[PDB]
Amino acid sequence: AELFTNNALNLVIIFGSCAALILMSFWFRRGNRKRKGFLFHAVQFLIYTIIISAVGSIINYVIENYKLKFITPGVIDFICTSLIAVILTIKLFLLINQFEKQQAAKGRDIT
Ligand SMILES: CCCCCCCCCCCC
């Protein structure tokens, strides 16, 4: 009914993504090779993007089929884009801090 049609496929995709995320969380043991700034960061970014896309699709489909007391419902798309941007910025800042720590541990000018 409410979750039928595109909602069913979207829910299945989101459940599969959550299962993959949990599997990756289990896989992630300790840092060293396990923590990949260039690979784990991209994997997490893709996971967040897919999750936000699925949530936005579900919410939009529900609202359009039920109406909304607000103009431009796509504002939630803007919120999802902002969340993705902030997540990517946080990941980039963490990577930069890790690189700075690695350089300092090996010797580099402070300024
Ligand atoms: C665009 C591809 C970037 C690849 C970066 C590899 C980083 C390896 C670091 C190894 C440190 C010992």
Resolution (Å) of this entry: 2.3
How many angstroms separate the alpha carbon of residue 111 from the centre of ligand 1?
24
Question: What sign does the dihedral 44-49-52-57 (CA atoms) show?
Answer: negative
How many angstroms separate the alpha carbon of residue 3 from the centre of ligand 1?
43
Q: If you search the block for the tokens 């007391």, which residue do you land on?
A: 69
How many angstroms separate the alpha carbon of residue 106 from the centre of ligand 1?
16
How many angstroms separate the alpha carbon of residue 85 from the centre of ligand 1?
23
Which residue type, as a one-letter code, is found at position 92?
Answer: L
DSSP the chain: -TTSTHHHHHHHHHHHHHHHHHHHHHH--SSTTSS-TTTHHHHHHHHHHHHHHHHHHHHHHHHHHH--SSS-TTHHHHHHHHHHHHHHHHHHHHHHHHHHHHHHHH-----
Residue 16 in tokens: 């599969």
